[PDB]
Amino acid sequence: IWLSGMYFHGARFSNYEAWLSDPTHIKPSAQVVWPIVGQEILNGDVGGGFQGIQITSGFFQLWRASGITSELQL
Amino acid sequence: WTVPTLNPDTPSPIFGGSTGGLLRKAQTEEFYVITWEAKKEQIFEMPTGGAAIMRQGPNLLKFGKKEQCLALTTQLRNKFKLTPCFYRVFPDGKVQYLHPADGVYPEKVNAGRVGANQNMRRIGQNVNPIKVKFSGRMMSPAEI
Amino acid sequence: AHIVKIYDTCIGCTQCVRACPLDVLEMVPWDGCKASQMASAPRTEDCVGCKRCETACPTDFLSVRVYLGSESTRSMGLSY
Amino acid sequence: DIAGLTPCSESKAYAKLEKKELKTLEKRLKQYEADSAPAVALKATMERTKARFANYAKAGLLCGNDGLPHLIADPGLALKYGHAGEVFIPTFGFLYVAGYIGYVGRQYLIAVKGEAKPTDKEIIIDVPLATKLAWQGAGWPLAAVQELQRGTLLEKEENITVSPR
Amino acid sequence: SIVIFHFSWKMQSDVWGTVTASGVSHITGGNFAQSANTINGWLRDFLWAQSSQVIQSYGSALSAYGLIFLGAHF
Amino acid sequence: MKDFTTYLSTAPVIATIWFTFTAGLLIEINRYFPDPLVF
Amino acid sequence: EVGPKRGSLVKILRPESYWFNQVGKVVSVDQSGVRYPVVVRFENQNYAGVTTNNYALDEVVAA
Amino acid sequence: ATKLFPKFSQGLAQDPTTRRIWYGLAMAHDFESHDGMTEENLYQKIFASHFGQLSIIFLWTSGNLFHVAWQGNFEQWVTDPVHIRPIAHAIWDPHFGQPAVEAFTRGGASGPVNISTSGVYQWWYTIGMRTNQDLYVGSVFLALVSAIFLFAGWLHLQPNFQPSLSWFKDAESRLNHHLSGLFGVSSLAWTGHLVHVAIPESRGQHVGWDNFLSVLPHPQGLTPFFTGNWAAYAQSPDTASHVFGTAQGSGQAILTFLGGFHPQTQSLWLTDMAHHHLAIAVIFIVAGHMYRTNFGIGHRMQAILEAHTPPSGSLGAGHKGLFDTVNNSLHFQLGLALASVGTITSLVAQHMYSLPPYAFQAIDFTTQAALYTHHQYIAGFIMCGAFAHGAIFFIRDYDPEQNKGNVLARMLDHKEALISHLSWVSLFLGFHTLGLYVHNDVMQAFGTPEKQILIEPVFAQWIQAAHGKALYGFDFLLSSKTSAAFANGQSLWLPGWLDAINNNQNSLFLTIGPGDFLVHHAIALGLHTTTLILVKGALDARGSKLMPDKKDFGYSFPCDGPGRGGTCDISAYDAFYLAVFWMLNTIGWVTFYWHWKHLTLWQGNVAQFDESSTYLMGWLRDYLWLNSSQLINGYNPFGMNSLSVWAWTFLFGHLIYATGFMFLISWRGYWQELIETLVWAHEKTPLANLVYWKDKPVALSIVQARLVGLAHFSVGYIFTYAAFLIASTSGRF
């Protein structure tokens, strides 16, 4: 369930597709917060026209190593 | 019933030795010796660590404190249903029988035992420490 | 040595004697309860103060009390 | 006004802080497009900031030298200068909800204490009884005052255990 | 904790860094060999110096980390 | 079904549902009424 | 016939008792001259997990 | 065999383990627990101990005077007390290298010295000391006084000089002599010194033992005192242009009540202090004639206590029997004395920073900070001791039969209500103070500082306005120009006091805001929680539901075993033990608040504190991280400076604190088993088994472990904060 959640977050609330075209400048992000009580500030400018929390789990690099290029596969 | 006498020439259980045995206290202060009778050869656990084999018949062992002897007594009584007994030996050679003191185990009442350290009152009836103050030394109200 | 005291609220259940790990307590005849027995402490010089007897006592409040007193080789449970 | 403070509608530091917040939000927005999700989210945050500042100034809050609103806890000053909405009305609101919760819980404990196994009802909550008591707890101040006046709110000293002193 | 502290300081001091013209500039400037031999060096150059990013993170996207940094002390 | 409802009536499940309801109510109030500081 | 009736509720008057000023059910009363003939059972256990105790005739009151 | 040490305990002397030495050292002053101790012998031993303590105090004072006179710069500091740092003593350490030698060589000395932070320079300068000869003479005099006190202590133990038990119980005579002689006459003598030496020395006139009999303190010479024209002593005071130590701008008055501070020294007027001591001397002397001793007139404290019971019976028997339970219990008297002394120590700290009495003390920021922190920590420790002795009184000296129905018995009658209400107050304060802090932290983190809750302290600001501060604008009492209270003091002391309180450059009633409100609530939480632990431990000292016979085990015992659910830390000693941590936390909060507010004040930016004290991140970054930069840079790979000793002390305190956590977390059993393995290793090692121990090695007891862990915790706490405070305040200024 946890792994499926990681793949779902990388497929619907991430910037993996944009990060593929520029992995040296775009920060990996796979978590977005809802705009409530002023917490939207946590959705930082990670690059690629995306706003979210910079993840450090390394799922982007693992997916790139496996040959995943689209959100449909995730 | 009569008080038994320690037999120093009694075979000991088969044990290869350990580092949890006797120390200088046995040679300078005192030590304890436990003896028991076994119906057959059986492997038991030593209170100081390890597994020993008690032989058929008399068995003698030495320990540094009385708690080790009573722990072995409890193990032999509850598991193998034996009746062990121990003594306190001094470096001069004096032997003092310890348990069972009157030949009967203390858990069961036996005639001839005189009660000691018994207060004919309850805890709530104890006096305050102020009435015990300025005594010979630190005394609790329960001691009177 | 520690001070072990028995009180008259004892019911003679012999649970404190069975729980003593150094043979300090025993049972003596008595007439103040149904069991006709009472706990006793005739070997307090060997008491270490573990208070297992107090843990095994079912009366409220306890019928056996252990007050930590002077410390010696036996009371400290030293094998050296 | 009170304690040498000035109203937030006239404080220069208040407007300066509003301009600073809008400036950093606009600076972050300058790096995105004009019809994208981050642009819409940043614009929504900017509108929320403007509305919050206007609402705080409209409420009549007092701002200090730092430009931040300051609350008045004294009932006399709050009722004399129109600051009862800061600390007075929320005080009574919390008292009502807190006493509501406490009264409902006390009623549930008293109700399940007369059963066969009250502890079982304490671990496994009786939902119908709890819901009925939760709905009936709206009149907790009146019921509490009546219980206090009848002498049934407290327990006698002889029925409460104490230490041997 | 001492293991991860050593890893972080060693990587930021002698491995990680940017590449410039005829030279490599590290994150901390190679101060591990000169300051990791004293407890004062670990407290000042590693704990006091590197904690600046988490204490002044308020008002940005990493502010949450700062909040947790305080919550974890609690 | 009776046993399932009794299980749902236990303290952790009831606490979870109640706290989810209370948190949702507070979140929705703060969503429709953003930044409430004074009455 | 001495002591409280079996099955009745009494209040403990022993100060050092855990159930002091608490109500307990009477189980049995000894007919001999023992110090504590009344046997009282309680619904709440003490710190030792015990729910019964022995009390004297003057240590319990019908409450 | 039986050892000689300890001679006061036969049971401890028969102990064959290392516990004998530790317990003999920790039970040396517990005279009530000694073998064959009586009441008369107890009082005699306490009398001798008191004399020895006075001897130590006087010797310590003489040592400070001698070192300042020998290795200090007092003769140069009096010339320029604004730009010259005081010198404590010289440094002679063979471990110092060359850079450390030139680093500590400062302050005009010829070698490495220590810059004093105790403030004895300002105090001695204000009271009249000018040269090193004066300090040398004072040091010799105090050494002689110390030797005399030590001889008195030895003499009162020999036969024909031991006081009887009845002499020690003469409460009326002792109280009369302490109020009239120890307090009133001493204050009158201090007034004589201020009028005769301090005041003329502050006006450039030298008055010493060689000419004080030929120099008049006032030009009218005792005539106005005898004729009743006392107002003649307040005529012609020091003007606003008076230079301390010189005759320029000096006056002739000796007893004034101008109020406020001196325009140059920023301290209280010497004439005002002299007049203060004279008034309190008269009051204390008059109060010293209240009790009946040997002339029929006076009171009997037993009669006043017995005749003070309310008629409705709200207080039961009232104070009947309270005279005997206090006079016959030394722990009750010790607890009362420690409670009053702790409160007075706190009062000293507050009044000393707000109203500086010594010349050029407010400019010395390090001295002010160190003095305030020192007195507050001393006060906290003394308060904890007062409550601990109250618990000891309940266990060892309280008699329910003698105190039947009085207020003392009624306190234990409703102790559950007191503990429960203390718990409720502490819970409310903690929940709300922490909630407001976390809310402000979240608002500052999300970039919305206008959304944090900032409650203005209108009550304290209202009090400040009542004292004369017109910043808030309340305009009432001393703040209003048309009030009776204002007009009645405009000719005596209100001008100077108003000018000083309306000045924002001093510490006299500093401006407060929401940050002050929040930290004051944190202080209230600390006080209430420490009080809850101490009060609960004193009331439950005689027993509880878990241990109905706790009084039969003494004040300090390990536990009651793992039975009945577990009884760890059940004694009253353990309650005091847990309360010491809360006391350290409370004093830490008050000293943190004091240091940060004063640091921002001295730096000229109070807005920094006003805007960063409302959230905990501001406290951690703008106060702890920002002010420790110079401290941790005392020694670095590029060299070192004079501030390296504070950096070493900082790390030293951290190490001691962490070492305390070991005795605090790990318990006896593990260590005892480890020690047994070590015993076997030593007994089975050749060339080493020939050397045997005299005491059997055993692990530290549970109570000893708690005491050792708390001692390390407190030592590390104190040393760490002292090093940080002194280094930050001295380096910044």
Ligand SMILES: CCCCCCCCCCCCCCCCCC(=O)OC[C@H](CO[C@@H]1O[C@H](CO[C@H]2O[C@H](CO)[C@H](O)[C@H](O)[C@H]2O)[C@H](O)[C@H](O)[C@H]1O)OC(=O)CCCCCCCCCCCCCCCCC
């Ligand atoms: C500058 C001045 C000081 C200088 C110090 C210099 C060097 C350091 C010296 C010594 C170091 C510590 C040595 C003792 C360690 C503890 C050993 C101990 O025996 O420990 C146990 C002792 C002894 O307890 C007694 O133990 C007794 C043991 O009796 C037993 O044994 C008896 C004798 O046989 C009897 O038989 C008796 O029946 C039996 O029960 C009893 O139980 C008593 O009731 C009980 O009180 O307890 C105690 O704690 C007694 C101590 C009370 C301390 C109270 C204050 C605590 C303050 C803490 C915070 C400190 C902060 C420092 C700040 C610094 C900032 C810079």
Ligand code: CLA
């Ligand atoms: C296993 C790890 C995991 C974690 C840690 C998260 C975490 C998160 N998810 Mg995600 N997700 C996961 C797996 C995970 N997900 C998987 C496997 C899927 C595919 C099905 C998804 C699909 C998904 C979607 C579509 C969305 C999220 C969203 C979110 C975020 C909003 C939190 C939320 O739930 O709001 C809602 C909170 C509640 C509904 C409250 C629930 C409380 C209930 C009532 C408790 C009941 C207790 C009961 C006994 C247990 C339930 C059992 C029941 C299901 C039978 C959050 C950070 C949202 C988001 O990212 O926002 C942009 C979003 O829209 N997730």
Ligand code: CLA
């Ligand atoms: C929790 C403690 C607390 C504290 C520390 C204060 C403190 C204060 N209150 Mg107060 N108050 C409290 C609780 C408290 N109140 C509660 C629970 C109530 C509800 C009953 C009130 C209702 C109240 C009123 C209606 C007023 C104050 C006022 C005041 C201020 C001055 C009066 C005073 O000191 O006497 C203590 C307060 C009282 C005994 C309440 C009665 C008010 C007295 C009689 C003074 C009023 C006369 C006049 C207005 C004084 C100002 C003169 C001039 C400057 C206008 C003062 C700072 C006065 C004020 O400054 O108005 C802005 C004011 O009129 N309070």
Ligand code: CLA
């Ligand atoms: C029926 C619920 C209930 C009620 C009416 C009370 C009432 C009271 N408590 Mg208490 N408490 C409770 C539950 C409750 N508590 C629980 C569950 C705990 C364990 C966390 C505590 C722990 C506690 C402590 C440590 C203290 C009090 C104290 C007090 C008194 C001071 C007021 C206060 O709010 O303190 C604060 C109370 C709390 C912070 C805990 C409240 C917990 C929630 C809000 C209660 C909800 C219970 C339940 C889930 C709801 C009923 C469900 C039912 C319908 C099925 C007061 C009479 C103080 C005291 O001794 O009196 C002077 C005090 O020191 N309480």
Ligand code: CLA
């Ligand atoms: C006028 C006669 C007189 C005088 C002067 C004294 C004086 C003293 N007696 Mg004594 N006594 C007397 C009569 C007298 N007694 C009589 C008649 C009896 C028999 C009934 C006793 C029975 C007696 C006993 C049993 C004891 C004493 C003790 C003491 C000493 C207390 C030690 C102390 O606390 O320091 C001095 C205290 C002060 C100077 C008061 C300080 C005022 C506050 C607390 C401080 C504020 C001052 C100021 C702000 C701080 C200065 C600032 C700066 C200088 C640092 C003290 C020197 C104790 C002792 O023996 O010690 C050896 C003691 O045990 N007396």
Ligand code: CLA
């Ligand atoms: C006028 C002040 C005063 C006086 C006369 C007493 C007198 C007494 N106290 Mg008491 N107490 C006081 C204040 C005072 N106390 C204060 C301020 C506290 C709070 C700290 C306490 C807390 C306290 C407790 C908890 C207990 C006593 C006990 C006792 C009694 C005997 C214990 C004893 O002293 O043996 C000797 C004392 C010691 C050997 C102290 C050990 C050394 C300490 C920890 C200092 C360590 C500092 C460290 C070395 C610093 C090094 C740093 C450097 C190397 C870097 C005795 C009658 C005990 C008692 O009544 O017995 C039942 C008891 O348990 N006191």
Ligand code: CLA
């Ligand atoms: C930062 C450390 C810390 C904290 C927070 C506390 C907190 C507290 N101590 Mg304590 N103490 C400490 C260290 C600490 N102590 C240490 C080192 C010692 C020495 C051993 C002591 C010794 C001590 C004693 C002896 C006593 C206390 C008492 C108390 C309570 C005082 C009442 C209060 O202020 O209410 C406020 C409550 C809090 C501050 C708790 C925090 C509330 C949290 C943050 C809210 C819940 C978070 C969220 C909603 C849910 C998260 C859970 C998650 C798993 C889902 C309080 C809970 C006294 C007491 O019990 O009072 C009755 C008491 O007698 N303390």
Ligand code: CLA
């Ligand atoms: C910083 C605090 C601190 C310190 C200094 C120690 C130190 C020690 N711990 Mg320990 N521990 C701590 C915290 C600490 N612990 C805490 C908080 C816990 C609770 C979780 C534990 C739990 C714990 C356990 C369970 C064990 C230890 C053990 C040990 C010992 C390991 C042997 C060793 O390191 O050799 C050398 C000693 C040191 C490095 C300590 C510093 C010595 C300095 C550098 C030397 C100074 C000498 C100097 C010249 C002295 C002159 C003084 C002068 C006045 C004369 C050692 C003495 C283990 C042990 O028993 O030993 C095998 C063990 O089993 N600790």
Ligand SMILES: CC1=C(/C=C/C(C)=C/C=C\C(C)=C\C=C\C=C(C)\C=C\C=C(C)\C=C\C2=C(C)CCCC2(C)C)C(C)(C)CCC1
């Ligand atoms: C346990 C115990 C005890 C106790 C202790 C204690 C008690 C502590 C505490 C505490 C404290 C520490 C206290 C204190 C206090 C204080 C008070 C009570 C006060 C006050 C006040 C007033 C009255 C004031 C007034 C005024 C003002 C307001 C300002 C201006 C001036 C005037 C004067 C006007 C003892 C030992 C005895 C013994 C027994 C046991």
Ligand code: SF4
């Ligand atoms: S456990 Fe208690 S009741 Fe039972 S025999 Fe021992 S002392 Fe008596």
Ligand SMILES: [Ca+2]
């Ligand atoms: Ca002179």
